[PDB]
Amino acid sequence: MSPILGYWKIKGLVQPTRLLLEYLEEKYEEHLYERDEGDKWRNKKFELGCEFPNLPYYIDGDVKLTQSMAIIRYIADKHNMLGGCPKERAEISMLEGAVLDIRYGVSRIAYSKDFETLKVDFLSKLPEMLKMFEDRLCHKTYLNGDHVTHPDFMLYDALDVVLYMDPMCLDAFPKLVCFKKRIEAIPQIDKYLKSSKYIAWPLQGWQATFGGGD
Template identity: 35%
Template sequence: MIVLGYWNLRGYAQSIRLLLEYLQVEYKDKIYHENGDEWFNVDKKELKTDFPNLPYLIDGDIVVTESLVIPIYLAKKFKKYELIGQNHDGSFNQKEITFLQILQILKDLRDQLNASAKVPSFKQEKDQIFKENFNLIFEKIKKQLGENSYILGNLSYLDFYFYEVLKVFQFFYPKLSIFTDFIDRIENIPQIKAYLQTKQNKIFLFDRMKNQFYF
């Protein structure tokens, strides 16, 4: 069985969970709690890779780390190449470049939001920060999406990642109402809809993270 290791939060693992659920792959969440003892003192030392990190994925003898690499491995393993922008047979498609570009842009966007929200002045300046730092990226994604249901035209991992980025933004900006149709579309994919109703998903709520940020 595939094992996905990560902290006891959504973080960079949640969109990978959504991908696993979409693929209907049996997997186990290996959860590390806040003190980090089990990870730093045991598993990190024993993980069979030169680059131990969280999240990690263990698939038999194969160990994959880094949040942007794990979904590529999964798409290739299960021959769902279109999920990473390639053609259905795994051959190159220009969408693959767009996939990687937007994936990195969204990760940077999310990291910037997390960093901004840890600064005390964020509470007073959050609307201005959104206008100056985030709004332009969302406008570019909106243009890329156009009239399509999904960012690349077809469903890809990028859509799961963007969905999670949007949920993070909603956490910090509860009144923010953007891409609501897109969010509904992802949440109504049968496999995702079923997962969102499970006890496992309920573990990874945002609310308990509030003491880490300024609202």
Template identity: 35%
Template sequence: MIVLGYWNLRGYAQPIRLLLEYLQVEYKDKLYHENGEEWFNTDKQELKTNFPNLPYLIDGDVVVTESIVIPIYLAKKFKKYELIGQNNDGSFNQNEIIFLEILSILKDLRDTLNSSARVPSFKQEKDKIFNEKFNVTFEKIKKQLGENKFLLGNLSYIDFYFYEVLKIFKFFYPNLSIFTDYIDRIENIPQIKNYLETKENKIFLLDRMKSLYYY
């Protein structure tokens, strides 16, 4: 069985969980608690890779780390090449470049929100911050989406990543009404809908973030 290791929170592992659920792959969540003792003192030392990090994925003898690399491994393993922008046979497609570009942009967007929300003045200035730091990126993504259902036309991993980014933004900006149809579209994918109803809300509530940020 595949093992996905990460902290006991959503974080960078959540889009990977959505991908695993979409692929209907049996997997185990290995969750590390906040003090990190088990990770730092034991598992990190024993992980069979030169680059131990969280999240990690163990698939038999294969160990994959880094949140950008894990979904690429999974898409190739299960021959779902379209999930990383390639053609159905795994050959090159220009969408493969766009996939990596958008993934990098979304990670920057998420990291910027994460760092901004840890500053005490964020709660009072968050609307200004949104207009100055985030709105231009959302406009670019809106242009990329256009009239399509998904960011590359067909469903790909970046749709799961963008969905999670949007959920985090909705946590900090509850009145934000952007990409609502897109969110509904992701949440109504049968595998994702089942996950949201049976697993996510029992373990990975966004409300657990309240103690870490000025929201």
């Protein structure tokens, strides 16, 4: 009747998936566990039929999927966006990993006691990572060319987050600044960000030192 995307009521690992779903105008319902509902999750964790119980999870009546990256790729796969041949498929997975180096680079330091200092190390190397995408966008509208692929929403999510860590990290990366605005300009995305469904905060778990809180 309608696929279900379950996760904490935060951006975290699943925000890019939500954006991809909105871009595709796919119908879905959400199981959003609030910060005071850890017990609620534990009572459902093992009764969903998931072989590798975790959050996020995506139940499609066709699959009981868990890992965030498998979920985003599945939805894109349903719409035939994963590639066309091994080379394009690898190209897209390479973009995936590259964006993850940034997004995980943030999550990895979030919630540690040393976040304030680890943040300076991450930000010192952020430019080198960002530069690769800036170059990539030199002759391509989106990461994989003229057409949107899931890594575009992944990059979008990563940019949204690092801007919170350093509001100036994109100064000097005009292509990236344009890209972020282009994604927001996509009718479906524009509508979603301005909707009741948009979860603007937190970036990480509420308990995180960075991107946490209400």
